[PDB]
Design goal:
This is part of a larger assembly, with chains A and B.
Chain A: H1 2-12, H2 20-44, H3 47-57, H4 63-78
Chain B: E1 4-10, H1 11-29, E2 54-55, E3 63-64, E4 66-69, H2 73-82, E5 92-93, H3 105-114, H4 116-128, E6 133-139, H5 145-161, E7 166-173, H6 180-196, E8 200-205, H7 206-216, H8 224-243, H9 252-257, E9 267-272, H10 291-299, E10 315-323, H11 328-339, E11 353-357, E12 373-380, H12 383-397, H13 416-440, H14 444-451
Parallel strand pairs in B: 1-4, 1-6, 4-5, 6-7, 7-8, 8-9, 10-11
Antiparallel strand pairs in B: 2-3, 9-12, 10-12
Classes of the chains: A mainly alpha, B alpha/beta.
The complex binds guanosine-5'-triphosphate (GTP).
PDB class: cell cycle
Keywords: Microtubule nucleation, mtoc, y-tubulin, SPB, cell cycle
Entry title: Structure of the y-Tubulin Small Complex (yTuSC) as part of the native y-Tubulin Ring Complex (yTuRC) capping microtubule minus ends at the spindle pole body
């Protein structure tokens, strides 16, 4: 739908060639599409939520879950783990 | 390393402070007085964690993991009627033994010894309802004789029944006693077991409680319920490190690691700024304080909940948990200023520790003047001063033996000689504890491991 809309727009702007209308249509297209991608990523993919999860998991941002995993797997970690199924 | 903790209500004060603490927790976690979470169970994302203290049978109901123990069924029935469905009726212990036959520690110890099977069965059943357990939080109410005896009995049972669990305790001491001899004897007998078995003990002297309740509240008359509200808010603030886990302290064992330097020194001194969840909390936005001012107030004697007796006091483990929108630069400035204004033992280079907590998303947000509060806990020897006068009482009454016809019944020893010997042993134990605390105030304490290897 975005392609059809902006294609009709550029078709209406074909007689001018290189004009400032072309540039402003480009700017509106870029702004709209960037806001749309940000919305889609934050809603359907939870971008900021993914960043928070990575910060809590890999960067150990959540001490509670880290302590939980430690008390869960301390027995296996203390034992030699040369063979891990 | 995080586990579930069960609350233990012993005595009338114990039950009252337990009721107040559970009401405060229901206020923080939006659970209310009905036991059903005031929030809809459709929102699964919760920054807090009620599991360490609330068992979840139905999705909207969170049963507080606590047992109600007392000899007076009136207060238990009152708390159950006010909190309809909130508490579990099967976890309410009264033993149907009637009213306490006096304020003797021996009476409570006997009523706990005889009905030990039922309370142990209830504790085991509650342990069966959980999987990851860490320890209990016992409320002594040592001002009462039956309450102190019951607390000592539970301590003497749980020390050997569960040695792998950390047992913290909360002893509330009165300011003035109508008959100082009986209350002093009960507190000494309970402190004997505290030194023997208890892993952590927080003292609560009622003098500072009355002073603060007269200062911050508008009413000059002080009611016991809103005074227990202070202790309940204190317990909620300290448990916030688990209910609302931070990124540094996430387990009660980890919290006590920086607070317990040795099993001997297990008595702490509390302090807290002007509260915000209490009854008369409207006169808090006129203070216009910062985090540095909050730390100063935490170090101020006017905000300590026990008898300060600050005569160059020696600190051993100074720690604090700050709840609210806290700034790191103010924290660094406050630490710089306090390290220049706090007496430390020269044998240890360990300074005070600062922790920052998070505010609940459902608690009423306060204005920018008292939006951030903090709690402080300092290991100080001056706590023995609270016992010193008490021992003084002992030291000036034990030469005759008054009120001996009341501690002879109930306990295993009906003779005067055996009770006298037990009291002398308890006095010797508390004397040795005071000697350990006064030796820890010296550098030769640590030099003892240097002189011999
Ligand atoms: N500050 C405060 N102290 C209390 C409160 N309730 C009890 N106490 C303390 O408890 C002492 C009285 O003993 P109780 O708590 O009633 O214990 P008890 O005499 O064995 O009675 P029961 O606990 O009902 O069996 C008083 O000296 C108070 O210091 C309270 O609500 N607030």
């Amino acid at each position: 739908e975005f392609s059809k809309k902006y294609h009709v727009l550029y078709q209406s702007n074909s007689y001018r060639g290189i004009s400032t209308n072309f540039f402003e249509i480009i700017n509106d297209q870029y702004s709209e599409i960037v806001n749309h991608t940000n919305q889609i990523l934050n809603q359907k993919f939870h971008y900021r939520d993914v960043v928070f999860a990575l910060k809590n998991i890999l960067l150990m941002g959540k001490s509670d879950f880290m302590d939980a995993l430690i008390e869960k797997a301390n027995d296996i970690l203390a034992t030699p783990s040369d063979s891990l199924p | 390393m995080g586990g579930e903790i069960i609350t233990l209500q012993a005595g009338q004060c114990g039950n009252h402070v337990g009721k107040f603490l559970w009401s405060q927790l229901a206020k923080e976690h939006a659970i209310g007085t009905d036991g059903l979470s005031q929030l809809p169970d459709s929102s699964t994302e919760r920054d807090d964690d009620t599991k360490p203290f609330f068992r979840e049978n139905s999705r909207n109901k969170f049963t507080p993991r606590a047992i109600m123990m007392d000899s007076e069924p009136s207060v238990i029935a009152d708390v159950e009627n006010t909190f309809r469905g909130f508490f579990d009726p099967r976890n309410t212990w009264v033993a149907s033994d009637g009213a306490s036959a006096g304020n003797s520690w021996a009476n409570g110890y006997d009523i706990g010894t005889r009905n030990q099977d039922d309370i142990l069965n209830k504790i085991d059943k509650e342990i069966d309802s959980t999987d990851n357990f860490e320890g209990f939080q016992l409320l002594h109410s040592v001002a009462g004789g039956t309450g102190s005896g019951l607390g000592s009995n539970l301590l003497e049972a749980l020390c050997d029944r569960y040695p792998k669990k950390i047992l913290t305790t909360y002893s509330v001491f009165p300011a003035r006693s109508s008959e100082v001899v009986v209350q002093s004897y009960n507190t000494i007998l309970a402190l004997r077991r505290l030194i023997e078995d208890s892993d952590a003990t927080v003292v609560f002297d009622n003098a500072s409680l009355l002073n603060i309740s007269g200062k911050v509240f508008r009413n000059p008359n002080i009611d016991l319920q809103h005074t227990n509200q202070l202790i309940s808010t204190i317990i909620s603030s300290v448990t916030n490190s688990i209910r609302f886990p931070s990124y540094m302290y996430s387990s009660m064992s980890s919290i006590y690691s920086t607070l317990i330097p040795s099993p001997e020194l297990h008595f702490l001194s509390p302090s807290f700024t002007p509260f915000t969840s209490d009854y008369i909390h409207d006169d808090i936005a006129h203070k216009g304080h910062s985090s540095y001012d909050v730390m100063l107030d935490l170090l101020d004697p006017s905000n300590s909940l026990v008898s300060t007796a600050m005569n160059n006091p020696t600190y051993f483990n100074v720690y604090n948990t700050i709840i609210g929108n806290v700034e790191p630069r103010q924290i660094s400035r406050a630490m710089t200023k306090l390290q220049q204004r706090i007496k430390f033992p020269s044998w240890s280079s360990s300074a005070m520790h600062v922790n920052i907590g998070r505010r609940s998303p459902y608690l009423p947000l306060q204005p920018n003047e008292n939006e951030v509060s903090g709690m402080m806990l300092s290991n100080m020897s001056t706590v023995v001063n609270v016992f010193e006068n008490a021992c003084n009482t002992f030291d000036k009454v034990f030469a005759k033996g008054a009120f001996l016809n009341n501690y002879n019944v109930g306990d295993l020893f009906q003779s005067m000689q055996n009770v006298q010997d037990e009291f002398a042993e308890s006095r010797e134990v508390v004397q040795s504890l005071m000697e350990d605390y006064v030796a820890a105030e010296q550098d030769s304490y640590l030099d003892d491991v240097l002189v011999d290897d």
